[model samples]
Target chain A: GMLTYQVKQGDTLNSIAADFRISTAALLQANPSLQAGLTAGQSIVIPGLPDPYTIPYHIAVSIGAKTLTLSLNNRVMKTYPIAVGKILTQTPTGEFYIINRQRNPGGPFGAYWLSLSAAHYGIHGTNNPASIGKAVSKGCIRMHNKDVIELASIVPNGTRVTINR
Target chain B: GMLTYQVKQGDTLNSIAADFRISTAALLQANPSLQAGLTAGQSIVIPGLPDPYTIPYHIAVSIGAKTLTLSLNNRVMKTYPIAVGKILTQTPTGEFYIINRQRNPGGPFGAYWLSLSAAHYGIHGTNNPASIGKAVSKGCIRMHNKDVIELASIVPNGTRVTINR
Candidate 1:
């Protein structure tokens, strides 16, 4: 939990935590006043991995509501509007884990692709941003580009993702 | 501990298993050498279900091998050649159960279709019998007409279907 780094332009608590391979909670645990927010040029400790208070990230997707919820340590963090699978290819439901991550996968997968352990399935941003809050995907969960980027920012690989109708 | 059923024109080990709601293995266990081939005019005791010895009907599909095994009494009853998801629409792997069932589903779904609790995924039959034993389905397990009928015959709703690659 030693060492420090200066926050550069566009640095958010999330990006900073990601850089150190830790959670934002870990960042806050080390420094008393991220209490406010991370500002450019602010220096913070690059804490050790396995931050004690850091909770595991869990994602829950609701097919009917078309929403993806991010939870930390069992507390709800944020919910994002999403696009679900189509009738012809309805999204499968059950518990899954984030198996892999890809940035800027291009075309249909807009900003990021958070692949689920379930083959050919994942939570990804869509090129059709307008399709958010609708059912249109082949079978993957779709989010707005920026929302997905924000989610990708905080959720590390291996987080559990539970889907339900 | 003991039971009996008569074999009709359509009564194969499958139909008999479905009739008794026990697996083919149970049938063969009580009446050995029935594996040589099924014949009409046969009569035998089915031997049982919910019996502490049987592990209950559980189906496991090995994607790589393209086979689905029906297990009961903690023993493998039968394994059938099947088709699985195409690369673009790979079948999901996870814990699930048979949520529904339909007979003579017509069209591409041959004689029987065993619906899985995994949304939009199931064990079904194909009009193109050649598709069996290959990864050619949209995202469900595909079986020969008779094979699927045999499977549906024995495994009741709520039976666990585990998919693994």
Candidate 2:
């Protein structure tokens, strides 16, 4: 069970592997039919995350509602208060997957960091709990430390995440 | 139930209504709190579509697999072969909602047309059955006439659609 990644412009094996926090060897192993070159629009298997095709979990973030809703098989499991990006740096809206995670990279990033497939963006815990219902972060979703830890505990990597404004 | 639309740059009441195939009056009726103007990041309700927050149906399109997958409450229901956009005019990848649809619009658009929230892009039927599984459209996802008709019958307005490559 692995996630599939579309090869984008300028993507090398090393770049894709690094973005997903996996090694080039792991990436190649998952995609055994790989040639030595890459082209845009080509699909490749990413090593670590579960295959989202079979995964039952999903995360939908509503920037307008300032909330993150967790679902299993399209049924709502729970909703958590969240802070989205500010006006000047509005959160990017799109479909993403939780490709990897880091537990407690402390300070402004509270107790956990769930990296999205989109580079430099993540659903993370925040030290400022009061900011949960406001649009204030640079771009990443900010959640209360406890809430994010609970969310991270339940959803595995490769869970589909839909972010909307 | 109604779907929420976050106001974007250059969005006007008339423009949003036209895109969703609803009248400006209908749009205003759904969002009584709406003032005379719109601003970026403001949330407005779109009339006619069910609130996606309570909807259990979802559609996921994979350009790489050239398939449209239907899921209920996150469980896989069925997958259908489809055609994607060409290299230069790639299908836009993101989270969107099936806002409205048209039936039996004869021509290149097969048996139906399901409009996406994004302007001009849609999931539609094609007269060319041989084009399935190939990247050949301007940007819209193309389906067999039978397939598009079946899909239109199963999904209603406001069904969430996630397109990825």
Candidate 3:
């Protein structure tokens, strides 16, 4: 299954699983910690789904441009414009491992959380879908629900995610 | 009026100024210490250039599959495919001030160079123009000659340039 999802404000497992078309059981099977309650703005990964998925996606995020590109094994997959935090809350930079995953995990973020260990940031879908291409988030990278769902299917756990500006 | 220009390998004051379409005299006037001779990857700025010039262009750079957006003020600019250095020499990330401008600065790189203060990297035009949209540079962000020139004209010297993977 995919290993990374960014937690957003108002996120819940039911909502996230609903978005991905996956069951909470499947999500819990992948991540046992959801019982502990999730936090907003965290990175998490959904454990088991399927692997050897048709397109293998790798992600690189540029904090400066507030853009994310999903590629399959070094090939361009898709580019999504993102909204990041302001300079004071500047997005964190440097290499990070996707430490956790979840589908429809609940917390301050609405739903669908991919928690990361990189301070307080993760890749996730947003309630304000229209703001995807514009600068809007506090610091986390925001994507369209559909786009994030598609991305979740391709990227597996332990995938390296680099955030910079 | 800019304060500095980071120098990249295969760069010179004369060629750097030429790339910006600003004369060597103007460049020297802006940068008094440039006579000391510049090294391959240094930062220096040309004097007397205006603060900012509006231009209609954009440059897109992608590391792995992540793409960063660069623009003059609010305009969407050109996009260039880029190759980034490995974790060892990982490209420096931070807010950078454009210190130097070059036109047709020849070497293995084509006719562009916009030196940044963060490191040896710059937004430069490549000798292999065909590689503009592919992963290739050792670490520096590469752009097409025409794209770089157009971007240089509008990008002010002190504009904040950010890099992230």
- The numbered model that scores best in lDDT is 2
DockQ of each: 0.01, 0.01, 0.01
Highest TM-score: give the candidate number.
Answer: 2
Candidate 1 CAPRI assessment class: incorrect
lDDT of 1 at A36: 93
Off by over 4 Å in 1: A1-55, B1-165
lDDT of each: 0.71, 0.79, 0.58
TM-score, candidate 1, first chain? 0.66
Could you give candidate 3's per-residue lDDT for residues B1-165 as a string of tens digits? 344456666556654653343456777766677667677766666564434223222334446653546764567664545545443334455445565555554544466677664323477766666655555444567766776776776665655566655
List model 2 lDDT by residue over B64-122, tens digit each.
Answer: 99999999998999899998887655788878899766666445567888879864468
Per-candidate total of colliding backbone pairs: 5, 4, 71
The Cα error of candidate 1 at residue A125, in Å, is 0.7
**Which scores higher on TM-score, 1 or 3?**
1
Could you tell me the fnat of model 2? 0.00
Relative to the unseen true structure, what is the C-alpha lDDT of residue B156 in candidate 2, on a scale of 0 to 100? 81
Worst 10 residues of 1 chain B by lDDT: B46-55
Q: Give the Å shift of residue A117 in candidate 2.
A: 43
